[PDB]
Copies of this chain bind each other. A is one copy, B any other.
Amino acid sequence: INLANQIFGYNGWSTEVKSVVIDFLDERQGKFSIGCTAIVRVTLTSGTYREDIGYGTVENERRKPAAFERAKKSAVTDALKRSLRGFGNA
């Protein structure tokens, strides 16, 4: 993630999470196999964006952190997917 804040400047690239929505909710023998779709929209200092969508899922999560960490992995998967789409080296 810091590689992005390294290719662009400390005030070069921005983030605006459009929508983060739940896909399903499971209760099978206490397992919570749930996923989420997140759409972040980066904005370089040149006013060029790269909106995309990423997914984040968790399988068992008995303690009920299934809604805890799914959000962060989904959001960071989308940040990685934006770099995959463009700005691979610049």
Contact = CB atoms under 8 A, between A and B. Distances in A.
Nearest to A1: B85
Nearest to A74: B53
> Could you say which interface size class chain A belongs to?
35 or more
Number of this chain's copies in the complex: 10
A63 to B, nearest CB: 9
A71 B53 contact: yes
A60 B24 CA distance: 18
Which 4 pairs across A and B sit closest by C-beta, in order of nearness? A55-B68, A11-B48, A55-B71, A16-B51
Interface of A: 1-2, 5, 10-18, 20, 22-24, 26, 33, 35, 37-41, 43-55, 57, 64-65, 67-72, 75, 78, 81, 85-88, 90
